[PDB]
Amino acid sequence: GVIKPDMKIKLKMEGNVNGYAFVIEGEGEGKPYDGTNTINLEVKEGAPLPFSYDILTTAFNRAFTKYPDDIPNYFKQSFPEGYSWERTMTFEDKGIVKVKSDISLEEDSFIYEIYLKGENFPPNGPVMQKKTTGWDASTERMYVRDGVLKGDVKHKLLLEGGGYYRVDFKTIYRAKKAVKLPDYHFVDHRIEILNYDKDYNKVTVYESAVARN
């Protein structure tokens, strides 16, 4: 078909967090049916980033999700035409991240065009102070509204020193063609920074995702 068992990844993110502009480019690979993917990121403008890299990582494609055969796959059906998504992340100290991403396909490589805005982060908060230590494993509730798929995550970031920092995710996924719509289901996530140079100019992100009834 169009979605191979091995697919490459290319992306560009143009970002602005509390007024600080930056550009990140990435390349990687994954196994869509296994629900795993790795992306190697480079900061192109804005290095070194003056905020927590964790607020970017979940922006760096649910095509990479293991789906049981009996739950229709909203994301894989959308190709070759593809899909786009938009996300609002609300942090417990009133910081906000807004993301738009367009996911397209060429040959055996996905292409992401990402725009990300962060705002209202307290100067002394864990994001601006770079005091976060990654995301917990999460469960995203997927449900259909207005002919598109929506996703909810009551998430938390882990903090340096053992604390935690709650974040609500709301995502809207929009296929660029008609597909068989699934009903209420869950996607379990695990996302991790595998390695980084000092100040995170070069970072590798790994994610696994599995859907379930």
From the CB of 71, what's the least distance to Pd ion, in Å?
Answer: 20
CB atoms within 10 A of CB 8: 15
CA–CA dist 53, 199 (Å, integer): 9
CB closer to Pd ion out of 119 and 136: 119
* Binding track, positions 157-196, relative to Cl ion; x by CB under 5 A: -------------x--------------------------
Site for Cl ion (CB under 5 A): how many residues? Answer: 6
CB closer to Pd ion out of 19 and 178: 19
By a kind-dependent CB cut-off of 5 to 8 A, residue 195 interacts, out of Pd ion, Cl ion, none, with: none
From the CB of 93, what's the least distance to Pd ion, in Å?
Answer: 13
When asked if residue 93 is in the footprint of Pd ion (CB under 5 A), the reply is no
- Angstrom distances, CA of residue 52 to CA of 59, 61, 125, 135: 14, 21, 10, 12
Distance of CA 112 to the CA centre of its chain: 11
Structure tokens at 14: 């143009």
Is the link from the previous residue into 126 a cis peptide, with omega within 30 of 0? no
SS3 percent helix, strand, coil of the chain, rounded to 5, is 5, 60, 35
- Is-contact 63 3, C-beta < 8 A? yes
When asked if residue 120 is in the footprint of Cl ion (CB under 5 A), the reply is no
When asked if residue 7 is in the footprint of Pd ion (CB under 5 A), the reply is no
Pairing of strands 109-119, 7-17: parallel
By a kind-dependent CB cut-off of 5 to 8 A, residue 120 interacts, out of Pd ion, Cl ion, none, with: none
CA–CA dist 201, 79 (Å, integer): 32
Q: Which of 2, 4, 6, 163 binds Pd ion (CB under 5 A)?
A: 6
By a kind-dependent CB cut-off of 5 to 8 A, residue 128 interacts, out of Cl ion, Pd ion, none, with: Pd ion
Choose the stretch contacting Cl ion; rule: CB under 5 A; options: 106-114, 121-129, 140-148, 177-185. 106-114
Q: By the criterion CB under 5 A, which residues form the site for Cl ion?
A: 6, 86, 88, 108, 170, 213
